[PDB]
Design a protein around this nucleic acid. Structure first.
Lengths: 593, 593
DNA sequence: CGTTGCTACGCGTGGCGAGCCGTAGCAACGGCTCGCCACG
């Protein structure tokens, strides 16, 4: 009667409409369209949202079925058409769009009609043949168009004007979903968020145009990503080349100056940052296509600016070196690269370790004896040793095999939760700081699962005195404090959606209390500090497993590796860090059976 | 020249005289008195009605002033006296009546005259002293009488014979005004009533005597009510005890058998029903006087019969339990009471909830562990949860504060109209059914504001097919239908007095149309069904407020509660019902500032 | 309900009447607040 998708869609409109500065990014005709949506019947609102969620393409009217809305959709379609929200096949004027609308038999039929060869050819071959055939001013395109429409019959499509309005509203509601591909899910009407106070101070978008350019970059990034994921690297390349063309064409626009003044945790919500991300995928595409030459200039270009994606610099330096070392075989620029990279303070310890490791390799083979004078800068960056055990396989999940073995070794409890285990404890012990008042712009509407600066260096620096006082309080805390604090947060917040916290990670509050008792205050303090100080990079390197003996309270943090799986650099940096806090860590290899 | 009070008085006489069966309830001398009234001059008719509206007591002739009738009333008084309509002080023969007529100085003067002590005592003390002094066959009463009359001077009083004739005529004209205290206002000459056709089939009063007994019960109920309202509970008790004596003295009279055969919506216009109401106030009086013992037998007596005031049974059961539980502290009869009450199908959901709530309380404390075997009958009567918000106070009207807050929350429209808002919409959407032909005895003269069965279960059952067809038609109605129907009734009936409909509740037809558009057909259908099916009990529990956003058409039904105000059971039953129809409901608490 | 001077003793509203040689008891006194009823 009042279905979820409509409810959730209504929440988003309400939120965005509520904020006057966001509303200044739309003109009067655009606001008028939201009004028109509100003036639709209920059955009309339901169909529009069911169609708005679908891929933007034409749909045959005989394929439209939503029994829960109406047994015959025709008058609803009619309402939406009169209101300017759907268009009918009278406005279907693009040959590609209609060729996309036909089934396989129909395309074949049309093919025979125009005497195409290979009519039993695949759809994409037919589509391609027809469009070429249409390129014979003016062309026979018009005739292929009318005959295809005769076949397709009555059809509707979501109009693009109104759709783009809702599209930008959606963007405004959840900015952290825009670059999510590579911080709007169904429950939105029903999920309870944490409490905090909205506090805005800074404009992200300079004007209506700024938002529109932002949104177009977003869609392009989404397009390119889609292509790459399906292995369509050639299409992925051309899309990236166009995106590349739009970006230079836009550089030195006055709006960019204002973007540069935003703090990093807002700056990721700007057009330039998005094109930088686009350029970064461009690198991967060039490599898949073996264009290692071209990949290197793009890397050097990315690294030559310092306004966008500083987080990415380590990945860039490391890939630049790899291309220089291996595919280009240029030994002296490679040394230069590693040394610049090592000097770059944005590079976190993982890539740093990776860069250094490559230096050692280069300094120690016939190929580079002569460059010896370029290796004296080398830091003494070392990472401490861990213990490795092996267990035999079975026919199954490698973590579950590990868990069974540690239960045989006296560790009757165990959790396979990766980073979520610690991040959940972090969440439970530091909730009121994660969600504290007084930090401008980190909470911009009432539907966030985290403060916007969470995954940014300024999270810690903006809450430093409270953090310093809380981490000291944890480090010294006796068991009973630890158990109590966890219970407090658990009791007061259970169910509330906080991105750090998985309410189902533990089998119960008691299990979580038992775990914090075994880990103890110093260890917990150490891990919470790392997560607060540098959450992106810490969450990823943490051991698969935590196991413990409920009698002795002996615990081990265990990383599990099956055949052909080894430690990444991140994992090596964090097993050592954990070891430094005095936790016992172990790597468990499952061997082929 | 032709003043309102006379016009209205003339309308009543005309109506009643017009009906021959009503006229059979008066004898020839009584009809003769109406004739004599008609034979009075105009100035005579005006004075009589101005005196008939006044309290029945003696009036000093030097206090009579009606300049608009005559600058000297003497010959008019003379006309009314000759005609037998007023009596003069020659017939003032009751010591109490004359002691009531004297001012404060005069009573003091008389007091000194008869050597009363405390002559500076209050009037009621003097009045009481004189009447005691008169009790010294025969007594000195005669002497106090003559000396008081010497002081009071020329005085007149409305004669009781003719007055009681007009009194019964008034009763006959508007029977729903008789029990109104606890369904004859000035405009009567000028108010336009709805259209409908008179259709009588059943005699309410068996004869002249029946009507007279009915009227005397009415006056007693009015007396007792007056007493209670002024906190004269002791006088209220004695009046009730006499009334109690008259009722038993009357039980098994043959006229009662005919009253029992009347449908409920006429049966309320009978002597027995009135004494039942009298007995019900008797309960409240006994409690005010802390006679909780006696209150309980009266309750048990009321509940032991099923012919009168079935509507009241829930109130009775609930008060019986309260007296048993709290003041008598009898735990086992209390359980019995609640269980009988819960079994009583006359008890509506409000008192039902109240009864159950008391059961839970009794089943869950040391006092009643042992009675566990008496609690197994317990129904699973549950009532769903609502949302509660709080806002800060200001120095002002709690509903107006709420309205200001919801305007801040984006609800630019709002109405504080309680039940009248919905009942007005009900009225506008169902007018021609509320006033339809074909239901015998619901329209008995041309001056009714509602069908007589309106507030009775038989309203719905007597119009069920038309109601079922109309509520289905509303449930499915598109916005444009809703707006149109409301406009139709508004246009055709505006001004006509219908008790359900407040022509001033909305600021205009358009506001009402905008509201019905936001509420939508299903919700409206749900509320109209409740009001049709059970109008007494539904109108009272409805939220103070309806607020809405004119753009999104989001609406909320809001109940407002200031300090020390909480939800009644009725309100809890109807917030849930509204919630069931999918309306969004909210309780707004204003907190002390 | 004060202040004080003398006597005796040792249904929603507005208008307006009613109410409130010292020392202890009481009646008059006005300003003020309340309740009742007529009225539209």
């Amino acid at each position: 009667e009042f279905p979820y998708y409509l409810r959730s869609f209504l929440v988003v409109l309400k939120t965005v409409l509520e904020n006057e500065d966001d509303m200044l990014l739309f003109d009067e005709q655009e606001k008028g369209i939201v009004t028109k949506f509100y003036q639709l019947s209920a059955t009309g609102q339901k169909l529009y949202v069911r169609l708005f969620q679908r891929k933007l393409s034409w749909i045959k009217m005989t394929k439209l079925e939503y029994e829960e809305i109406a047994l015959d959709l025709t008058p609803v379609i009619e309402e939406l058409t009169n209101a300017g929200f759907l268009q009918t096949e009278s406005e279907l004027q693009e040959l590609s769009e209609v060729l996309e609308l036909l089934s396989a038999p129909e395309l074949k039929s049309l093919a025979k009609t125009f005497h195409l060869v290979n009519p039993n050819g695949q759809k994409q071959q037919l589509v391609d043949a027809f469009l070429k055939l249409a390129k014979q001013k003016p062309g026979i395109g018009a005739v292929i168009l009318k005959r295809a429409k005769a076949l397709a019959g009555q059809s509707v499509r979501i109009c693009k004007g109104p759709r783009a309005v809702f599209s930008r509203i959606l963007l405004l509601f959840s900015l952290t979903d825009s670059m999510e591909d590579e911080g709007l899910l169904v429950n939105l009407g029903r999920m309870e968020f944490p409490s905090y106070t909205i506090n805005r101070k800074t404009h992200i978008f300079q004007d209506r145009d700024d938002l529109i350019r932002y949104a177009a970059a977003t869609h392009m990034l989404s397009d390119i990503s889609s292509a790459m994921a399906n292995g369509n690297w050639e299409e992925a390349k051309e899309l990236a080349q166009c995106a590349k063309r739009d970006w230079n064409r836009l550089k030195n626009h006055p709006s960019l100056r204002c973007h540069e003044d935003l703090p990093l945790f807002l700056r990721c919500f700007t057009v330039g940052w998005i094109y930088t991300r686009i350029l970064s995928r461009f690198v991967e595409i060039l490599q898949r296509l073996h264009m290692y030459e071209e990949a290197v200039r793009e890397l050097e270009s990315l690294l030559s600016q310092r306004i966008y994606c500083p987080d990415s610099r380590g990945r860039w330096w490391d890939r630049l070196a790899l291309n220089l070392h291996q595919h280009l075989k240029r030994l002296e620029p490679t040394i230069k690269c590693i040394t610049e990279g090592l000097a770059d303070p944005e590079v976190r310890t993982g890539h740093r370790l990776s860069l250094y490791q490559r230096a050692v390799r280069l300094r120690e083979s016939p190929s580079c004896k002569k460059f010896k004078h370029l290796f004296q800068q080398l830091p003494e960056m070392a990472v401490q040793d861990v213990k490795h055990v092996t267990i035999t396989g079975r026919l199954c999940s490698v973590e579950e095999l590990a868990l069974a073995h540690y239960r045989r070794s006296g560790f009757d409890q165990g959790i396979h939760g990766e980073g979520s285990t610690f991040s959940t404890l972090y969440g439970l012990l530091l909730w009121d700081i994660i969600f504290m008042d007084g930090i401008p712009d980190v909470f911009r509407n009432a539907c966030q699962a985290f403060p916007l600066d969470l995954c940014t260096d300024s999270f810690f620096t903006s809450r430093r005195p409270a953090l310093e006082a809380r981490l000291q309080l944890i480090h010294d805390a006796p068991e009973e404090s630890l158990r109590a604090w966890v219970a407090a947060t658990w009791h007061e917040q259970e169910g509330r959606v906080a991105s750090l916290v998985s309410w189902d990670r533990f089998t119960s509050l008691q299990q979580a209390q038992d775990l914090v008792s075994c880990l103890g205050g110093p260890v917990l303090s150490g891990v919470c500090r790392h997560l607060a100080a540098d959450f992106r990079h810490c969450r990823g390197g943490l051991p698969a497993l935590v196991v413990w003996n409920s009698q002795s309270r002996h615990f081990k943090l265990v990383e599990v590796k099956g055949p052909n799986d080894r430690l990444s650099h991140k994992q090596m940096i964090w097993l050592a860090e954990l070891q430094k806090l005095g936790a016992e860590v172990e790597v468990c290899h499952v061997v082929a059976v």
